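Hey Z.,

So I finally got round to the S-adenosyl-L-homocysteine thing we talked about over coffee. Here's the setup:
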Amino acid sequence: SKSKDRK
Amino acid sequence: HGVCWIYYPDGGSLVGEVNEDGEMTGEKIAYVYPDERTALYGKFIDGEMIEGKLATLMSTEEGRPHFELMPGNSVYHFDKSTSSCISTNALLPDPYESERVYVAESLISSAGEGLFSKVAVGPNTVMSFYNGVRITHQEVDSRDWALNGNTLSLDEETVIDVPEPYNHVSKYCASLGHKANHSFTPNCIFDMFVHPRFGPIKCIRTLRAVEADEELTVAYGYDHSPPEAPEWYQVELKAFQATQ
Ligand SMILES: Nc1ncnc2c1ncn2[C@@H]1O[C@H](CSCC[C@H](N)C(=O)O)[C@@H](O)[C@H]1O
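And the result:
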């Protein structure tokens, strides 16, 4: 994913 | 005649006399930040902040908090972002965050601005809030990295973003968590936070003691083997992997 801090 | 405290996992709380239904509804309800001292005191309905005035918790007597209102007229309300609106008051700072962090030039080479501690704090200290507009993983994942500098996954349905031009403090300073630079050896982590103005968001929390004027950093946590990441991070992942 192109975002911070995904689980 | 009894007062109740309702804590969130992050250490913030709602406190006051509840009404006949056990609801946080009244004119003397407060949200108390995780320092157990900074408070937003006033009118709440079923735990939602309608008019919270900035206050300091001075003591508790028999469980009842005794506040002093801060001078001025800093008032706050529940103001959850949407897909297109980051805040009704983009330039109104969070009063807890304003005492803990500030923005300045990063110490990291070529990294632009960074987020710094104003004072010395211990481990597990909430320092900053990461509010932003709320958009989908589909929109974010289906668009170029150049637009994804500030995207933060909140949960499986929502990504928080601080899109241009709100990435500049002169346009948006209600929260500052998007100003923390990345490190593979960070001194902070992202953690869930329930904020009385922003709603469900994430915060930046220290994982160790930090000194006054120390730069705060977090691991951005991009997927290293889907690396799905911007170039600078890939170039840094290489370096970090070498040191290992
Ligand atoms: N470790 C690092 N090395 C180089 N650039 C970094 C970095 N961590 C963050 N950045 C920069 O910061 C952006 C994320 S937002 C972080 C705050 C930003 N430096 C600013 O001035 O607003 C990234 O797109 C990248 O440009």
